[PDB]
């Protein structure tokens, strides 16, 4: 097949002009969508804050208006998912992955409205869920919509425009352009076959997405950590250790999300009325814990810089970690619309801090800063649970800008993905798709 290759080599990287321009518009819209979704979430959390002050005398009515304000918003988000687009429940990365395998539909006329408005309900109430899940599904659906509006034909167009929408989606959620591309190239792509996803086109959409985000967000960074210290060579083996601890934890957390999806299904049986009521109680618990112990609830981005600076006690970090493991499962396994990606950065940080502070007191000769271990651990639950380590590493690098830590970040991530493989765990997005494709057949 040599003369075939000579021809193909000579025809490499000539994506059709139409796909490239359309990639541009897909990115722009995904950017504007993500910006809007981001401001919408914030505006409701505010309304909720200003409610708690018209009510800040009567501590009992305080805890009540915290609970019902988030209960109402939660149910609303649960309800529109079950009523009009059930595949907008949970994250949405597994379904956009399925769409890329050509085994799940991109029902953009229904998911766009429910995922956007349903996510605002669940995130805006202060549930432990992220923007990533929403913005990538919303971004994929936006890809499909542009495809259907302009009736572009071919496998290339359908796969690329679907890929760039979910890439521009992650980029715009984190101000993280390199992470978005890599998430497609390492995780979301069809993993067992070649595809004609143009990468140059995914690149164009990511740019425009990221430019839209900078237009409405500049001057303030998602996570500001400052510059931490360097890592001496004789410190590296400690990051490997930390990796191995993430590698054992990764899969165990994956059991919990899945079996927790099972358990909480038992509660409502599948009934949209018991279900919406269940999410109303989970939502009320978060908006309540949001007042009574904020680090137990919410997306968790707030406590990342705090934990990195060593300003939490070890007692607090253990408490937060347990609690947040708990509230993270309850919210994502419940099937509320919204991601688990960003709360895993939090869980990783908190854990890595606690390792760091043990490492500082065991080795004063190392001159450790617990913060370097928090930075190594941030993308570590990502590496051992969803097994996209190159994406977590580039994402953490883009968000915290401590490139001098690249080696302990790599090392921690690979140990996590190595010990997750070696202890019998699977990529969580793939094991969520697989279970979803396994009852889209067992009903026959």
């Amino acid at each position: 097949r040599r003369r075939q290759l000579i021809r193909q080599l000579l025809e490499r990287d000539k994506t059709p002009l139409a796909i490239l321009f359309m990639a541009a518009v897909v990115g722009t819209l995904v950017g504007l969508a993500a910006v809007a979704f981001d401001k919408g979430v914030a505006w409701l959390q505010n309304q909720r804050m200003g409610a708690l002050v018209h009510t800040a005398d009567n501590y009992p009515l305080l805890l009540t208006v915290a609970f019902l304000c988030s209960a109402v918003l939660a149910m609303f988000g649960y309800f529109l998912v079950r009523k009009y687009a059930p595949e907008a429940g949970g994250s949405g990365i597994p379904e956009i992955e399925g769409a890329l395998e050509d085994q799940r539909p991109v029902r953009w006329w229904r998911v766009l409205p429910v995922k956007f408005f349903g996510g605002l309900g669940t995130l805006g109430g202060g549930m432990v869920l992220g923007r990533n899940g929403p913005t990538v599904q919303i971004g994929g659906n936006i890809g499909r919509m542009v495809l259907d509006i302009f009736r572009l034909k071919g496998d290339e167009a359908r796969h690329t425009l679907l890929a760039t929408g979910a890439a521009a989606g992650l980029a715009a959620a984190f101000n993280a352009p390199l992470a978005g591309i890599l998430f497609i190239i390492e995780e979301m792509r069809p993993q067992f076959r070649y595809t004609l996803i143009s990468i140059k086109a995914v690149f164009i959409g990511v740019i425009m997405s990221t430019i839209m985000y900078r237009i409405f967000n500049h001057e303030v960074a998602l996570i500001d950590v400052g510059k931490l210290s360097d890592a001496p060579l004789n410190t590296l083996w400690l990051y490997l250790i930390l990796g191995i601890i993430f590698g054992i934890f990764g899969p165990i957390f994956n059991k919990w999300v899945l079996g927790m999806q099972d358990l909480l299904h038992r509660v409502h049986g599948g009934n949209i009325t018991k279900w919406v009521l269940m999410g109303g109680a989970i939502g009320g618990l978060c908006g309540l814990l949001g007042f009574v112990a904020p680090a137990t609830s919410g997306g968790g981005f707030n406590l990342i810089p705090i934990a990195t600076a060593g300003n939490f006690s070890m007692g607090m970090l253990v408490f937060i970690f347990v609690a947040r493991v708990i509230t993270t499962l309850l919210c994502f396994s419940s099937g509320a619309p919204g991601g688990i990606f960003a709360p895993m950065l939090a869980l990783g940080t908190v854990l890595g801090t606690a390792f760091g502070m043990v490492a500082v007191e065991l080795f004063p000769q190392y001159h450790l800063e617990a913060g370097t271990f928090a930075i190594a651990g941030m993308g570590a639950l990502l590496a051992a649970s969803i097994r996209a380590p190159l994406t977590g590493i580039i994402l953490v690098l883009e968000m915290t800008d401590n490139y001098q830590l690249i080696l302990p970040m790599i090392i921690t991530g690979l140990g996590a993905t190595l010990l997750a493989q070696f202890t019998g765990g699977k990529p969580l997005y793939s094991a969520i798709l697989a279970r979803t494709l396994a009852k889209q057949e067992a009903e026959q």
Partner: antibody, heavy 121, light 107 residues
Framework: EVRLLESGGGLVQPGGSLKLSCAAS????????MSWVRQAPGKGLKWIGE????????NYTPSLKDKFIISRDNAKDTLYLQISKVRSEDTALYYC??????????????WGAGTTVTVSS | DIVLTQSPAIMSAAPGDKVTMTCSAS?????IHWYQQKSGTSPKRWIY???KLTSGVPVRFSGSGSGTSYSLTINTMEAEDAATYYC?????????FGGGTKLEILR
């Protein structure tokens, strides 16, 4: 150049206190751990203590509760050493050092000239 | 703490001649440093990580060793090599210097 200029060492009466000062010039003095080492008359080098750039960690040699107090003010770019209940054992040349590492086994990167403490009635 | 003991506590040697001092530890130690001090002068970092020369340290100088015993060496002594040579460990905490080795000219 990179300069360490320590001052504040003089004659002090037994049981007194004193506050030595190291003035850093010619390098970003944030970023660096700073250290005190002293040399008693005709004797070897003895480590006092170290402070990290954010004063969040300060270690001292195995030696009594509020004997030494190391602190830094990275704004004026100067390192400090308070000595208390000073006895003649504290008669020494006092060195201020910038700390670094190669493979990660920490060494005394650059030293100042010293100041001499004499404690005597 | 780790005790480091430098061996020929004082010693003399003619110029253009091969000198060798020792450092020895109560326990095992890793990547030892060596500082050179002339009277009236700040100590100068001389050799680090048991074997590595500092920027400017002439090539005649060299270190070696492992575990519990280490060494400094000057293949061809010069005159400006007259000084005191302190070995230093931070493999353990807290870090400890040696007693010193004073090296003076022979004439």
């Amino acid at each position: 150049e990179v300069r360490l200029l320590e001052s504040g060492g003089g004659l002090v009466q037994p049981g007194g206190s004193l506050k030595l000062s190291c003035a850093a010039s010619g390098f970003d003095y944030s970023r660096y751990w700073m250290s005190w080492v002293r040399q008693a008359p005709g004797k070897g080098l003895k480590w006092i203590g170290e402070i990290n750039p954010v004063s969040s960690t300060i270690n001292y040699t195995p030696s009594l509760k509020d004997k030494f107090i190391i602190s830094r003010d990275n704004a004026k770019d100067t390192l400090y050493l308070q000595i208390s209940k000073v006895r003649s054992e504290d008669t020494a040349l006092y060195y201020c050092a910038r700390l670094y590492y190669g493979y990660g086994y920490w060494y005394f990167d650059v030293w100042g000239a010293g100041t001499t403490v004499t404690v005597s009635s | 703490d780790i005790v480091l003991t430098q061996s020929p506590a004082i010693m003399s040697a003619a110029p253009g001649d091969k000198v060798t001092m020792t450092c020895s530890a109560s326990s095992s130690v890793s990547y030892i440093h060596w500082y050179q001090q002339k009277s009236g002068t700040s100590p100068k970092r001389w050799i680090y990580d048991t074997s590595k020369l500092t920027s400017g340290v002439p090539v005649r100088f060299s270190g070696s060793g492992s575990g519990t015993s280490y060494s400094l060496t000057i293949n061809t002594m010069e005159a400006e090599d007259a000084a005191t040579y302190y070995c230093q460990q931070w493999s353990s905490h807290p870090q400890t210097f040696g007693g010193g080795t004073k090296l003076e000219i022979l004439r």
